[model samples]
Target chain A: RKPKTGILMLNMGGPETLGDVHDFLLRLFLDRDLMTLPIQNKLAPFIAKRRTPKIQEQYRRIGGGSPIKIWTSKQGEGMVKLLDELSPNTAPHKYYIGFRYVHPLTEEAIEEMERDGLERAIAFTQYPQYSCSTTGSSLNAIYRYYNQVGRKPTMKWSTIDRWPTHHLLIQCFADHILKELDHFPLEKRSEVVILFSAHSLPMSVVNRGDPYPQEVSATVQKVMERLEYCNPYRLVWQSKVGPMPWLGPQTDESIKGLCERGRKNILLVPIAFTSDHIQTLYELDIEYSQVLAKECGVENIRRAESLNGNPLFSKALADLVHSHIQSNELCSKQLTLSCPLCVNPVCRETKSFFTSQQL
Target chain B: RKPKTGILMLNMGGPETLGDVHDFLLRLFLDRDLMTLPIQNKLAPFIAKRRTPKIQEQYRRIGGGSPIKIWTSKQGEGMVKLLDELSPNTAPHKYYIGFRYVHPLTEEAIEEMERDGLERAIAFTQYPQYSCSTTGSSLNAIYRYYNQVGRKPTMKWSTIDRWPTHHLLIQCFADHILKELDHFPLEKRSEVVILFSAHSLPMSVVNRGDPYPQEVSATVQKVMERLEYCNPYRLVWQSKVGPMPWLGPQTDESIKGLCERGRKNILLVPIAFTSDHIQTLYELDIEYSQVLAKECGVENIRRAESLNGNPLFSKALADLVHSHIQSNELCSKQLTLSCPLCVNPVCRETKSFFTSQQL
Candidate 1:
């Protein structure tokens, strides 16, 4: 029998609990993939050393840990089951999970795939919107690993770098949101306001014409079109870092203003994220949840469920991969002049978490 | 018969317009005050050179520039007027506005204050909660100017590093939130969940026992105690930088969870921040607001009015200063340490937007 096409899922890793905060942060900050500042290469260890003590305390507050790794693993398990059930043709296509920075490191995962004699893998970054710093960096690292080993796989490979405006993806999100709405009385549904939030990036990234924000906006626009809610809706940015300017308007400020202005009903969607992590767990669940309800005089707070291991979303992923394979365009779409090896004048500068591959 | 004490207000500066993205980021990263990474002193210029173009593009989206300077100026003007009306004795005290990273630099402001021949000064950072990076750094910068000139003003100088839990301040914020509550019916108000958001700091800062998150929580706790409502409340962190661990639960995640749990009303209060800046204008207002209201199925979303130029808040500031000066203490409560230069030892590592001399 012909070997089936394999699916490999990728995600950003997080410390599983308070105990994991130190090492998790170290891994995250040390990975040149996420942090490429030349200064950081030298400074990160010092910075991380200085920062570990404080972060440990913060991790303690959020139930003494993050469930990202566990959550992500569960998601991987669910996808494996779903893919087998939904599209049996892909059953021979074993599913593997890889984290950018953790025990299940990409390098290790690739080694496992090779050990399993797996070939013709369809690689996907967990984040939906494509950026050189995230998807680009990960791919670059994997490619570099293959090059370093001088062991190119015999099987053909393809990648799905982005799916910013995928139809089923949007529909799945809309469906998740609608389920959250069912909890409210039917009569009050119309009064609810919709809020879409994505992680923030420095304005520099966007200025470089990184399509992350635009992609988020497009998804929001498409999701709204599909939902057709009469209540007003807004888009916001969250998790901005550093002092340098980041994309805006941020999620927290908008919520405060809306509450001050007397609008009460609020719904939130984590549009740019595809999985649950620290940002989703401690930041949103405990911190903001209490603040909005108790201090801001807001009437309600709601969030869309994570797309982790959702059957529909998994099936969509498989379909997307199948389509890419059928078109024989997976490598083509990503390998054009825009490919990492190609020297785009724009690609030569400082790269962020997801931009260009170093080396 | 003696001249009233002059007031010096320090702030974090933003770009003048939406288009000043590159310049704004250049100022932010180049300034040692914000990012204190070991590489900051050596690599900031190179990073700045490479990152500015892309950052500029982001500023173009929100009216083409940062409105921080203008908003801060307006806040300063209003505060000055409010101060004048609050303490008749201090009415003659001139209020000087200083921006740490922009025009009206700290040194220039001090020179202006000295040229005005003001003998005594009351130094205060605009932030309600003190962070070494923000308020602490700026304060240090101002003191350095005094050292550089080798001519100290005869006027007594004291600082209001932070006001973690002041009753009048809490009441003022509550009143502002109540005003927004008027937009929704009382029945709806009961359902509203309050989310208190403060700017985030690296977990390491907290581990080092920085008082930032604690101060924020103390304020939030007091505010909750003062309010009659029993709606669920949460404290969240915003504007986290880099991959370094930051305090949580993040505002974005909390908003989403509340929605999933079937609660509708959501309101946010920036307990740690006072005026509208990037965190307020873009992070909370545009990003999280839409995410909570639409995607999560929340019924209401709102934010408390920022204390920016609020008369009540300004009055509180004047009172805080009066109390500090009267006691000849650096903080609100009397402490064992009496020497001004002998600031908290950990203070040496505090971050801010400007240069300063420390104890």
Candidate 2:
């Protein structure tokens, strides 16, 4: 009989309402893996409180909340359906959402899996391109949780760290770009610039050798190759927070430069994001579109739709699970392989940390 | 020969970058019309400075800046396009964006109009649902600009204070709601609750008989009447900023109450706003959805897309302008009228103040 396996999907959770905004901020700031600050344990709560009203106002504007959990939940449900059909051999596969900061957190999801009597598990990160700040932090949470428990579950476990070069994932993004490009008139298609925007990371993170930038570029390159048309494309970073210098060229500056250079038709692709959340919905669609029109005088700005519940993207995820189960590969080879740029000890140390601890 | 006309679109402008966030906050607090406080002129800057870093971080999450100016610019472009098609009699209509707190301030836009040598102008407000803080403040700025210049424009001026019940505007919202409802399964359509959310106003404004709440309700009521399906609907206020109470049936509380009553499907409508901004994009979609999933356990929630550059909505604005030109209505009658709740002297005083000075 096939062993019962648990599919653990990890993500950075968000606040549910204005009241929760402060708590969400506090947790995010307190996470040493995500943000490092002086006296963080003491400073995190104070900063979170001070920042609540302003951030609360943003949540109030977007509809009094964040949709991360909902989309992640939907994405979870979609994966479950796809896995059932694509890998019937891995029947009885149960899915769990392991959010790092908020409710249904990593520990809670692990506890649920323990209670479910699953004999094997796969830790699948939602972040297609890995970042130490995101996937690393989440994976650390799982290890820390198990360490604190002082007891291991009778379950064998492995993880999929980074899949930036996943075939179906690249195809899904290319398909979205091809569809969004249709928004521009046929005559203007050649001139329509494709902007592949990813979330910005601090220079500190990049300097420490996170493979996120390289992997994100790889995804962009593969998607560009798949596209039928030879449209000019550039990778830009967005949603840069804090005072630190982040990866460039920034999305806003790039859009302005394009506008100044007389590129009126532009197709913005949120290549880094797997789901539709504030970044794609508000920033790229509303904020950037506004910049395109007012600053660029470009009337034909369109955004490639996010890979939220796209069937092809869901199928790709299922296929990954099926292939892993078939090969009995403990995880992606990248889990053990550190990028040459990585100077952080955690990148290499964590692999063995999880390996030796696994039951 | 077609007569020359200037369309002055008035709004509360936002910062374009992290650097401008502080100034935007400072100007917002300093405005006596919006936030009345002790030694406000002296204290506003201090409060603004204290608030900037926190507010700046919020902007960072939503794509490094605000999209208000961009949306406003697009609205202006759409209006210009529609005006050319619908009101050719006023063929040489010029559009200028007059912001309250930032660049292209009322004075700057008015100066441009004077330079353009326009013979007539309309101070059309972007606030579809008027408030003493928004439209009132904007109108006051126009008067103050003229007062400072020591001379009124050579142009004959009129204004459009509020178009909450414009038929085409109502139809545009209804159409959007209809399209969003289609996302829900056909079997669940009837059970989907329509939550009409508007930005909350402080008791100070509501107590002053601002007519915003009444007009906002009027807008919500009209849209409900126009919707093809009779989904159970509620009007809730969101984005309440300070410690003081603003409006009632807050969106968060309403969603919780719905969940308590076993309602699963929800459709959120940002009734007060004309374009997609932070409120509709982040608050409703992100923050609120989180609450629904975690707190309410409601799985199927959807939001009506904001009427951002929707051709139908643009047509409505053009029609309002065309009718105003033909009938020569010097703004909405509400400009001169005050609700019984308003005891604020600025309400009626500003109206006569502008009427006496119009050239």
Candidate 3:
């Protein structure tokens, strides 16, 4: 009989409602991966409590909650369907969502997988571009869970860390842009500037030489090559929340400057995102479009669709899973990935955890 | 010949650089209309100093300065051009920007107008929808300046308070939204949700029965009636700064609900704003859009154009000035308007200030 396989997808979970906003923020603030302040253990709770009302109000405004879980669930369902078609020999493939800070956490999912008696599993990160803060943190949570259980699962496992330049992913993005470009007048198409916006990272992360910036740029370049039409495009960053400086040529400033320089028609493409979330939905679509039309006098400004539930994107995930299973390799061996600038103990520990487990 | 006139436009000013952010915040916090804290005279400075660094970072990201000055200047120039055409009888109308809290302040503008030897003048509150907090505050600054000078201006003067239902202003909003609706597919046009967003006021002001909310709604109602198409629309608030509860059906929440309910296309209309300020350019465009797109999943959310230098909007300002001149009416008499919710001492005082002066 074919081996029972569990595909565990990892992500940063979000609150489902106004009440969850408080818990979500508290968990996020307490997480070492997201923030590390002086007296953070004591300070985190205080900060979270004070911030809860404001964030609750924000959540209240955004339909009283977040759509992250819904999107993740749909993506998992889509991936499962695609995986079955792509690898028929791996029958009875089960998909699980392992959110870092919310329900169905990595540990809970791992326990469920163990209960199901899965003989094999894949630890796949939903983030296309890996970060020590995101995927690394999730991996750490899995390891902690195993240690707490005081026993390893009999199931064999491997991991897919990053696939920033995946072909199907690039195709999905290119196709979305092409479809959105149709909204612009055909004669004025060439003049339409494409702004590939990504969520900005703190300089602290960049100083650690995380490959996120490089990988993000590579993805944009790959997608551009796939597009049949040549249009003026640039990669800009968005949603810098704190006082710390972030990546330059912010999406708002770029649009403003372009309009100042007489660029009329523009299309915004969210390259770093795989699903519609606050960054893409609110910041890029509603916020940026307002400035472009009113302040910049840009004749037409539009946003390309995010790759949520895109069949091509689902196929990419399936391909990644199939290739990983065929190679039968751990994350480090498969990707040869490590933080280039600094030593990341978490990344090393996660690698050791995967290799130490017996198949 | 109609006496040479100085149309002094009033508003709250903004910083021009990372350095000025500190000063701007200090002035803003110290103002009674903006913040009325216990021991505010002392607390304002302390609060401003603490908030400066964070606000500075926000300015740095949006291009090293606020765009308010630029938009205001453009509006002034546009108004001057329109006034030349609308009231050719007043051929040499000069426009001046009088910011309550920054350079080119109310006093400085008044002094400039005095030196320019204008025989008649109009003190116009650029805030289309009046709040005791904004127009009241600016008017107080003007009266304080007159008291300090120990003598009033020799020029005959009048004022234009709020023009929330001005026909041309409503037409400008309607026209801009119609132009933006073209971006959505014709089949999907009716499905587009029109969100008329305004800067929120505290409940303290609301309980006082400030005309702002009612006037904002009136503006929305007027604009909607002129649109000629039946698209779903609602007035929502944005940018609630402090802990105080603000106006409801917040813009962010409205978008989230619409998206959750399967409203694919959204059009954001900024009803209260006349120029591109931080509230419109940053909070609404960048901050709100990020949430709407990412959190909400509204497919084609877009912001309608602001009234910044819009010819129709400028024409409306010129028409207001012309009407005021023709009627020879003080602002209080022209609108028969006072703070209906309660007695606003500032509004009553400002009216007395204008009427007390000899024409």
Candidate 4:
């Protein structure tokens, strides 16, 4: 077979079973890419062990695991299969899956690429909005993996972390959101507050001048613009774990606040993450829509489904990737500027390595 | 010597003698940043005239003048001398004084730096924790002064502000707390509550996302952590200065609240001040500790001294600044970020100019 144009897809992976919960959680916490705790190596395991049982029950409720892997695999296959047709000059395109904090980890992708004699690859981030905790983490792992195995592999790489406001991407989210509006009563459809919820970033990151907030806001704004001002929306945050203050109008608090303010018909949109997993299915769909809604005496609070297995979203991915390959851009301008409060030498090295390297 | 390192000490300068009080107050309210007053040139002088005699008497009570200039001048010498030995690669170290609203203006500091043929200067804030109103104003003044100077120097600039929770800085406060606690009768020693009183910024600043309160709280927490949380504590606000709301539990109200709750033995720590000025000498000690203590029927509300000549605090200054130079950070992530509700174009331009400088 001719040499494949490899697409390296990346995400922060999740446990696929109750048994994988502890290790997955441990890996998530242990990776300083997520958050830096004092004595992180030892302390992370302690937190993971404590949180595992509760997390396992949540996984069980969501049908025994995150569907993240499934959707990611399908999305990857769907994207590249279309890419081969979209740009036949780079025919027979292949994608290698890389996950941070789980099996089929980023290193495994490196192994596959090296073994397959891959020469050209795009280290693509799956998160729509770049955060040091998420996209930066994934990219950093790729760089670490490349160096760790003690080999100089020849692979020309291009990366993307600035696709938050892409037209096709916004249209995909807007389409799903518009469809979800029908779940509410027709009289309340136009009045439903489009609650664009992303995972909460700690004030440390927000204050560190992480571009995530602005990028997430950009995604929200662009999607709203695509909706043609169909319904009023507010960006709120969710999945805040620790005691430290994170960005707010927190998702649940906003729901409660809106209820008190008599604006209860709310549609929760997961604006940051590209695909469905725990946050959407469990945290928002179960906890907020079911659990918190009852406590707030809200009957109409509903969540928009994540952009999983959507054809337009796959096309959006293929189109974006194809155009990037043609543009020959290494990374976004935003990727070069570390967050103002960034103290990570590894992150700086990673950015420089990506931007300053040759084919 | 590798290269001479200049530590530029930044602060809102106080009147040196009783005679300078009127002009100092007049110059202060004239700052749009310090406080925006309409027809400020005329209004500032009237208010300064109205307030000067009583303020001058308070200055007299604290030994005839504001000792702020005296303490800050000493702190610079205290830190820079140690830094010469500590990090000689960026030494021999020099101190440049930049006071926003008094003698030896920030302009003068710049002129002297250029005259001395200095190449590297660190704009280090005297405020232990940064508030947009205090540290921001000082920086804003420097930026404006530099612009008006006709010829900008070729000297390189970097910055170091917000050292609120440096380990040595925390230890410095914690040690002082312990020393003061020992002053209490043996039975009451453990019962004494630690009250951290930081100078309060206006609620407008707090609401608009000033990092001061959050960073101040971090310092309090770290200090307690170092103390092993041996005594109960609360962080309170002092010197709010207007009818408008400021970040509080004003120091007096907190004393009453603590008194009613039967927490009588209180150690009032000046967590914000680098050393004693009118705020601490007059407001906290003479007024709250003495005057209010008598009114509340409690003589046990003792006050902790500022970090004027504290060896450990001087060490913290050297350690923080030394590490900052070693890291080669241009400025903090917080430095470039304007307060969310900031309308001041100077504040915007100031942050940009500092970070824009190249080595």
Q: Write candidate 4's Cα lDDT for B1-359 as tens digits.
A: 43367788888888888899988887788888777777888898899899999889878877788677777777788898899889867767888788887887777887777777776888898888888788888888778777886566568888886677678887888888888898999998876877778887765556455657656765775676688657756666674456875645567666665554456687899888767766543244556556555655564777887776577677888888988888887877556545434557788788777878886
Task: Give the better candidate number (3 or 4) by TM-score.
Answer: 4
lDDT score for residue A136 of model 1 = 61
* lDDT digits (tens) for residues A39-108 of candidate 4: 8988998999999988998788768888788889899989988998998887778987898978789888
Model 4 stretches with alpha carbons more than 4 Å out: A279-297, B1-359
Q: What digit string (tens of lDDT, one per residue) describes model 3 on residues A1-359? A: 44388999988787887878777777778877655789988988898899889777666665777777787787778878877877777887888999888887788899888888887888898888766777778877787777777887668877887777777888888889999989999899877877778887775665343546546765775676677327756666776766875644466666666675567777988777676545433243566667656765778877887787576777777888888777776773323333323344555556678767565
- Ranked by lDDT from best down, the candidates are 4, 2, 3, 1
What overall lDDT goes with each candidate model?
0.61, 0.73, 0.72, 0.75
**Candidate 3's residue-wise lDDT over B1-359, tens digit each?**
33387898998887877888877887888887665678988988899899988788767765778666777777778888888788877788888899987888888998888888887778898888777788778877777777777886668777887777778888888889999999999998866777778887765565344546646765775676687436756566674556765645455555565565456687888788776544433233666666656775657867776677476667778888988788786664322333323333455556677777665
For candidate 3, the TM-score of chain A alone versus the native chain A is: 0.89
Could you tell me which residue pairs clash in candidate 4?
A340-B333, A341-B333
Better of 2 and 3 by lDDT: 2
Residue A63 lDDT in model 3?
72
TM-score of chain B of 1: 0.80
Least well predicted 10-residue stretch by lDDT in candidate 1 chain B: B333-342
User: Runs in model 2 with CA error above 4 Å?
Assistant: A1-359, B1-3, B280-295, B339-346, B353-359
The TM-scores of all predictions, comma-separated, are 0.46, 0.48, 0.48, 0.53
lDDT for model 4 comes to 0.75
TM-score of 3: 0.48
